[PDB]
Swiss-Prot record, chains A, B, C, D, E, F:
Location of cross-link Glycyl lysine isopeptide (Lys-Gly) (interchain with G-Cter in ubiquitin): K4, K10, K14, K24, K36, K40, K46, K62, K68
Sequence positions bearing Omega-N-methylarginine: R42
Name of protein: Microtubule-associated protein tau
Full-protein positions shown: 625 to 695 of 758
Location of the protein in the cell: Cytoplasm, Cytosol; Cell membrane; Cytoplasm, Cytoskeleton; Cell projection, Axon
Functional summary from the UniProt entry: Promotes microtubule assembly and stability, and might be involved in the establishment and maintenance of neuronal polarity. The C-terminus binds axonal microtubules while the N-terminus binds neural plasma membrane components, suggesting that tau functions as a linker protein between both. Axonal polarity is predetermined by TAU/MAPT localization (in the neuronal cell) in the domain of the cell body defined by the centrosome. The short isoforms allow plasticity of the cytoskeleton whereas the longer isoforms may preferentially play a role in its stabilization.
Tissue: Expressed in neurons. Isoform PNS-tau is expressed in the peripheral nervous system while the others are expressed in the central nervous system.
Glycosylation sites: K40, K46, K62
PTM: Phosphorylation at serine and threonine residues in S-P or T-P motifs by proline-directed protein kinases (PDPK1, CDK1, CDK5, GSK3, MAPK) (only 2-3 sites per protein in interphase, seven-fold increase in mitosis, and in the form associated with paired helical filaments (PHF-tau)), and at serine residues in K-X-G-S motifs by MAP/microtubule affinity-regulating kinase (MARK1, MARK2, MARK3 or MARK4), causing detachment from microtubules, and their disassembly. Phosphorylation decreases with age. Polyubiquitinated. Requires functional TRAF6 and may provoke SQSTM1-dependent degradation by the proteasome. PHF-tau can be modified by three different forms of polyubiquitination. 'Lys-48'-linked polyubiquitination is the major form, 'Lys-6'-linked and 'Lys-11'-linked polyubiquitination also occur.
Domain notes: The tau/MAP repeat binds to tubulin. Type I isoforms contain 3 repeats while type II isoforms contain 4 repeats.
Modified residues (Phosphoserine): S17, S45, S49
Modified residues (N6,N6-dimethyllysine): K4
Site (Not glycated): K4, K10, K14, K24, K33, K36, K63, K68
Subunit details: Interacts with MARK1, MARK2, MARK3 and MARK4. Interacts with PSMC2 through SQSTM1. Interacts with SQSTM1 when polyubiquitinated. Interacts with FKBP4. Binds to CSNK1D. Interacts with SGK1. Interacts with PIN1. Interacts with LRRK2. Interacts with LRP1, leading to endocytosis; this interaction is reduced in the presence of LRPAP1/RAP.
Length: 71, 71, 71, 71, 71, 71
């Protein structure tokens, strides 16, 4: 019995913002005016002009390989 | 018995914003005026001019390989 | 019995902001004016012009290999 | 004056014996019998059953790029 | 004056015997019998069963790039 | 004057015998019998069963880049 398997495989993930050229994203002027407001419960507030985000919870990679030989 | 399998496979994922050239997204002027507002429950608020986002929760990669030989 | 398996495979993940050229993200002018506001519960507030973020909770990599030989 | 040319071109040459599968060329039995031969000038002789050859004297690749800007 | 040229090009040559699978070239039996032969000048002789050759005198690669800016 | 040229290009050559799988070249039986042969000048002789050769006199790579800025 002669057993000589070869793996040369590439198992790859490329995830997010990549290989990009000359990106010039512009946020404009943002004005928020708030007067005499009442909040009676929990508040979360975001005021921005530009968000650039790559999240990538994924992109995950998994290899299982399994050799059994028996006599 | 002679066993010599060969694997040269490429398992690949390319997910999100990639290989882009000259992107010039421009968010305009944003004005928010709020007066005398009453909120009796939880509030979440987002104000912004431009959002550039790549999420990629997926883009995952899985390889299962098995080689059982019996005599 | 002759057993000589060979693994030369590459398991890779490339996650986030990478290989980018000339990115010039520009946050605009941000103005927030607040008068006479009342909050009766927990508040969280984020004010900013530009956010550049790569989170990558993922991008994980797992390799299981096994070689059982029995006589 | 704004000058921002971008080149993403692929200049490629693929020359010879490539991407072939299961080639089994078989040269036959060759018998050469020579008796009482006379040679009065230079001799070059090749005897063989099978030749597999890729010459590729060419397959060359040339890229000339120029960017002159004047004021 | 703003000058920001970008080159991301690929200049490539792939020359010879490549990416081939399961090639089983077989030279046959070769017999050369020579008797009483007379040679009066330079001789070169090659006897063989199988020749597998990739020569590649070419496959060359040249890139000329120039960036002249004058004021 | 603002000058920021970027080169990320790849200049590559892949020449010879490469990326091949399961090549099993087989030279056959070679027999050479010579009797009473006369040579009156220079002789060169090659006898063999199998020749496997990659020469690659070429496969060369040349890059000229120039950045002249004058005022």
């Amino acid at each position: 019995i002669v057993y000589k398997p070869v793996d040369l495989s590439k198992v790859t993930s490329k995830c997010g913002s990549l290989g990009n050229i000359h990106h010039k994203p512009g946020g404009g002027q943002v004005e928020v005016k708030s007067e005499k407001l009442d909040f009676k419960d929990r508040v979360q507030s975001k005021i921005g002009s530009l968000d650039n985000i790559t999240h990538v919870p994924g992109g995950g990679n998994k290899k299982i390989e399994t050799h059994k030989l028996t006599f």
